[PDB]
Subunit: 504 residues, 4 copies
């Protein structure tokens, strides 16, 4: 007899577990509980703040929602018009001293003429090959080259992706990319070159919403707050230390035992394996490759420079900086950094030299968020990475040597990306059915280890669907058919379904 008994136990209150909890709470049928070792809900979608008052999120991939249900929950959580700011999806690729609007291939008119020739030639080759193709690419790398041709592939996607995944593109599968044909739009590319134009893939239609306060972490705090407090257990009192799969009981730090009929686990699956003391799974989960992510934050004194402007996120294929992506985080909300009247001293200049004085001066302020990837194939010196990022900012002309840095931030996330390697699926098809046979739904970024559904909306929906499968027999579409869900409007599932309308 365990100390607590519930039908459905949810481990983890990141977006995945919150998704499961939200759906359980709406269904209000089977009994349930959600636990997490952190007092603040949000998991890795939480937001940090420096002593100087600069917020930083864990990533630069803004929200794009594929589901009405996700929208319902975000809207319930933060219902006021002024709870959000809307922006156009503005991004550029840093290449040869130029900010090239995304998508790269549609904007190579900014490159020197001879390089345009090399690019067009390679894409001509790719189009002619795609005309008689009778096989599908097998690696991320083959997919890139079939889409872009050699010249364009070498300038951006190949070196960029190495910096993103910390593995070569030849080591990765390409199913996670979706099912689009690996072929160039040669006319679109020659057309912009001939017309000598540039054009980003953004406009009034292509927008994202960012929360006015508390970063992305603020979304998840407000979602979590809609849950019945008594069904949550957050903090040390909720840290799971053992999972006894055969007896269907969990044991917490404080010794509390919880019995369950079904388990939704959102912890990394390698940690779950260890927690189950299941040696066969420990071996299998150790085969799952992943990269570690360093997030660097830099707060800068001054009004937003013209050269930065309305830029949102930026891609860096080149080797003159260690980060793959930068975000102008101060463009997302005026509350991601201190107000202009707030007074801070300069810590250092961008060229690394001491400020003229140590006196606190006022703002306004702007803020940059940088991402760097580490793996066995790509080491990162944690002792120098901050300074290398800052020099990277100078090298890319994001900061003048004279810019005044008033805040710095560095954090290393051991589990950063679950890598879409060639071996991933072969390993996961061994791991997930074994857990499934024990009534354990292991789901989430590292819960199910599939990158393509490991961001916020998809993960939230992994949790939702896991519960919908457990209770209503729904297909888990997002877990197993990401292309299917991505290719459509998912409007059927709502925070208020027929069931609740008829019950009231």
């Amino acid at each position: 007899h365990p100390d607590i008994s519930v039908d459905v136990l949810v481990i983890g209150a990141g977006p995945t577990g919150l998704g499961a909890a939200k759906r359980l709470n709406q269904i209000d049928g089977p009994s349930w509980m959600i636990v997490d070792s952190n007092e603040t809900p949000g998991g890795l979608a939480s937001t940090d703040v420096t002593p100087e008052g600069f917020l930083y999120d864990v990533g630069g991939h803004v929200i794009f929602s594929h589901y009405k249900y996700f929208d319902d929950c975000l809207d319930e959580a933060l219902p006021k018009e002024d709870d959000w700011y809307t922006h156009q999806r503005i991004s550029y690729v840093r290449c040869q001293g130029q900010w090239v609007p995304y998508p790269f291939q549609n904007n190579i008119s900014m490159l020197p003429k001879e390089e345009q020739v090399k690019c067009i030639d390679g894409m001509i080759d790719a189009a002619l090959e795609a005309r008689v193709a009778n096989t599908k690419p097998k690696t991320f790398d083959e997919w890139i080259v079939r889409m872009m041709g050699t010249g364009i592939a070498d300038l951006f996607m190949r070196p960029y992706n190495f910096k993103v995944w910390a593995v070569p593109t030849t080591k990765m599968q390409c199913a996670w990319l979706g099912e689009r044909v690996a072929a160039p739009n040669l006319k679109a590319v020659t057309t912009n070159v001939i017309l000598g134009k540039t054009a980003g893939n953004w406009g009034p239609n292509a927008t994202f919403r960012f929360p006015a306060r508390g970063g992305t972490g603020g979304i998840w705090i407000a979602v979590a707050n809609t849950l019945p407090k008594e069904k949550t257990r957050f903090g040390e009192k909720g840290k799971v230390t053992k999972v006894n799969a055969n007896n269907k009981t969990v044991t917490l730090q404080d010794g509390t035992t919880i019995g369950y009929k079904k388990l939704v686990s959102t912890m990394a699956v390698d940690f779950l394996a260890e927690a189950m003391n299941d040696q066969e799974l420990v071996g299998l989960t150790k085969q799952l490759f992943y990269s570690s992510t360093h997030v660097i934050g830099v707060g800068v004194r001054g009004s937003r420079p013209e050269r930065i402007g309305d830029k949102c996120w930026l891609y860096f294929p080149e080797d003159n900086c260690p980060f793959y992506r930068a975000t102008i985080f101060s463009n997302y909300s005026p509350y991601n950094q201190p107000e202009a009247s707030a007074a801070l001293p300069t810590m250092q200049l961008a060229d690394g030299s001491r400020p003229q004085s140590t006196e606190a001066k006022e703002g306004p302020y702007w803020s940059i968020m940088l991402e760097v990837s580490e793996s066995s194939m790509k080491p990162v010196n944690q002792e120098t990475i901050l300074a290398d990022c800052i020099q990277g900012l100078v090298n890319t002309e994001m900061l003048k040597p004279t810019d005044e840095i008033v805040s710095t931030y560095h954090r290393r996330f051991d589990h950063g990306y679950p890598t879409p390697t060639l071996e991933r699926e072969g390993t996961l098809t061994q791991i997930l059915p074994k857990l499934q046979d024990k009534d354990i739904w292991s789901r989430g970024r590292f819960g199910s280890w599939r990158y393509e559904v490991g961001n916020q909306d998809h993960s939230f929906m992994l949790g939702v669907e896991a519960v919908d499968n457990i209770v209503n027999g729904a297909v888990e579409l997002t877990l197993n058919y990401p292309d299917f869900v991505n290719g459509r409007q998912n409007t059927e599932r709502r925070l208020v379904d027929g069931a609740q309308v008829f019950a009231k």
Copy 2:
């Protein structure tokens, strides 16, 4: 205020309506009711019987279940081992005097050598073109010719499909077929010709189940039998005569009114427009094309002939018989026809002549069911179709001139197939969303007018998923993505889900 009020009203107690009802009954949340103008549930999945005791179903497309949910409901309806018989999926194409195992192209070694050359040459052309193809086929005919080449198309698919659909293949779309690339397996086809091999797509693992009694109609009577009687209204008492979609009320023939919050309608959508008195929808629904089906049944005296053997269904591309498909219905269950000891006089010989006497002789008996299609592009003379079918049986060597016929059956089903025309989707996108905007889920073979989800398992699930959409916010996967549901094991939805397991605690 109306006489009766329910959250969800279902019109029709064919497989689709019964599906909706089963799901509503399992969930047992929103109130609901199911009405049908017929006293006997099962809709067009019902079974007829001749005065002589021969059973006939409405078609020859046997059950293949794509869903565990469907299996749960059939098994619950008919749980005994002896409620079913299992048969291998044995089918052949009648061609130039031969029974050619299906699939046709893998078995052309049975044809004359010169015909094999023509077939292979055609498939070589199609392979060569498929190698540089940069577009998808737009019509059923283009699909057929790309898969099979001209020689093979002309012998089977083309003339056969005209006979099935009662429209030319050039008039049909090809999305309903699934997503498989239209290209020939040249190597497999030439390999079998070279080896002189024949090979049916059946075996110990390719089987179907058929109910021991009452034909397919017996399945749906038993499924309906599991519902609570007081939530059903079957017979003249349940005939819908008016649908007021703005009031969300329905009026029955006896004057009863039913208010609903959501309507699952499984009547033919063209009949729904009329019942709604919605002239806009009438206009649109009249643009939908359909064929009418004649089912002919023939009871024969004798032990099962050797030439017939274990054959299940048979295809007829050639123009020496009016039917496109025949079924040896007596092979499906010994209770589809009378016992050997039953005495029946001979009605006629297969060559059409009278028999000498009126003497009632004994069996055993075997039984053939034939299907013929009719449309405005292919009329059928109802007055001679029976005699034409019988002569077709003689032409195809299924019956000898002297075989003794002891029972005949003929019925015309006006809405037979909803035709997958080139125009169908354009029209449905104007119709179904307009109905949806009124909280009307029009679903079924003719409720939603998509052939590819219009047989028993799919239709049943259309009903189940419609309810799941209404109540649980489920995706209607079968309605909009038949290729998705047909390509996977649909095991998630069960007659007993977690919701029920947990609630009984």
Copy 3:
């Protein structure tokens, strides 16, 4: 017996006949004679001069020799360095107010950008189809669209060729073009577009030679001058009126009869049929299509304008002028027009009005030559063509309205181009072998009616090779395999061969 007998009789003293004469004279074996109705040798390669002293040739296709034999004869005829001028092969296409260097597709960077997009889009389509092509184009038009794509084909080659041939491109064969594959060089075109580059297909090693004096006519007068005069019959005394192919005799205007063993006829083959009184050949030769060519010459007062500069020939696809090609004939030689000190009055201004002064004034002078085509499919107004040409010169900005015209020239050549129609070969494989069996070698621009071997170097060698076939059993390579002769260095046949060398010792 006839008045004169020779082994080989040659009719015509144009390039083709003179070629036959030259080879016969070099071999100096069989006896021979060459006749022509013009006292001045050179046939249609002759040069006219206006009363004001401007020379005009018959066309603007400059010499490119494919044969050392041809070079030998021109050099023997005009041996001095000062008998010739050398020029780079400079040409442009007039398009949308601009002079675009030939070849057109390599220079579209000159057109507006939105137009370059259409051109490249079209060539992209053509490159993609060329990748999977398994047929050869059947028509000039098909060949054009496969090489260039629709956009580019529409800007230059289609409308230009209609103006040149006076029949639609869809009505012509494409073998005469050579054997190069009809596919676009997409990379070269896009590369130039991207680099913003223009590039003409000329330079220090892409040049032509033009005679210093007397135009091309001067070459042929001088080549003829090397023949033994007693074997020539030029003038009214050499006009053939009758050919009796059965007797192998010819009758001249003055009643003189010439008997031959082998006849090399370079007159137009349709006229030959008539002279033969051969009704079957008359019928066959009338199936051959040809266009008529108008040559217009314009003499202009002024030093050569900068806008003209070193231009040699110029192409005009557009509608604003009736000519297809123009030639700055004064760039070819200072002796193609009068010296600066020559005094001539202005006949008219280029805008058509009368000049202010009737007074003779001095030069310098420059000179334009224009070509206009006409046929039954593309009629031309003969009465207005001169004025229309001059207005065309104003329309294309070659002349200013105020330019002073001091000389004009206009001549119509009835047989201008023998047209490479789809029908040409079928006809010629009846005509040529039929004459062949009479021992008549009918050769030349209209002798054998194949355009692609109808210019000076090729026609000359047609004559030479005919003789070499008659005497030495040589292959007639030029007549039957123009791609073969055009793709190689023809260095073997010389004005002094081993035969002459070994005999002189």
Copy 4:
């Protein structure tokens, strides 16, 4: 001054030199002379006979004339209808116990079904690749596999050609083959399979002409006999020992020196370089690959066996015999072997055992001629090759173990085939121009070293055209454009041209 002076000197009296001399004699203009070290004209187209009375030619490639001129000289040399026998071009490939009619691929219905499947499958692959091909094959091997597909290539053309050329197919060029596209006729091949049909490429109009007497050797003796005897020097008196390219003189073995203005040399070009004492040319010519050919003749007692019948020549891809080609030489003329009444003892039985008696018995007789190739890459044991050939005859069921052999013949021709290696052209376009610059027309099988024009008709015409080039400025079409001459009817040049008609 030299002992003799002529305008054109021709060295060698094989088909190539006789062609040259024939054209010179027709033109009867410039003075000329033809020398050869052999008293009997005909070069390697000469014919040996065994002591027992069996004739053997040097090869089994029958005459197909591409020129009227050649026909004229053959007709003049041997004008009687009874000077020739005509026969259908009947050939077969020995494969897995069967005689398969040529062409092999239209006749694979004779092979086991499983093997038919593998063949058709490989040809399907080939047809599908040829549908999208945009390059030309670079090697003989690539050409074969693209025409036939893998299965068929491996059964016949690949192994057969190794035995022919004595070098692998991968090491040879493919321009010598002609300009036909490398693609399968898939429908013809599958059609004959489906119908169970066999069809050879012969019939009443696909015939060849063979000399009634003396073998091919009699053709050339007779041709030579039409030349003015005083213009020939054949035998020891005509052996060239030195060629002084610079003074244009030739020195013979007997000491006599001959001056020339133009030289037509038809000796092997590697010997010409040696005779010229030109070490630059020696070096180049030693880079030319060639194989050595062994010809084996077998004379057999008995009427022609039914199993042989009307077979003319036969191909042998398999390794149960050393020869690549066999010829039923007794089928070509009843005078290639002794009359039936001639008496000969049996020398051995086909299985290698002695005859029961050494008594001489009568015939009739039939005769087989075999070809074996030798090179650095494929050694032949000169001392056992004869016996191995005879065993090969038993292995291929051409002879029964009991067949009585009454005559044997074996001869090694050191210069057999000039091999169409990949390097050939690179080497030849250095060698011939240099000789041309010295007014030397080196022409012929080994004079110019191009196999594709090294048989009788082509070689003869090389000699004719060389003279026509020297005298009349003719193009040497056969030497430089063999596809051109092979694709047409060459009717223009005749033994009586206009120049001779008019000279009368």
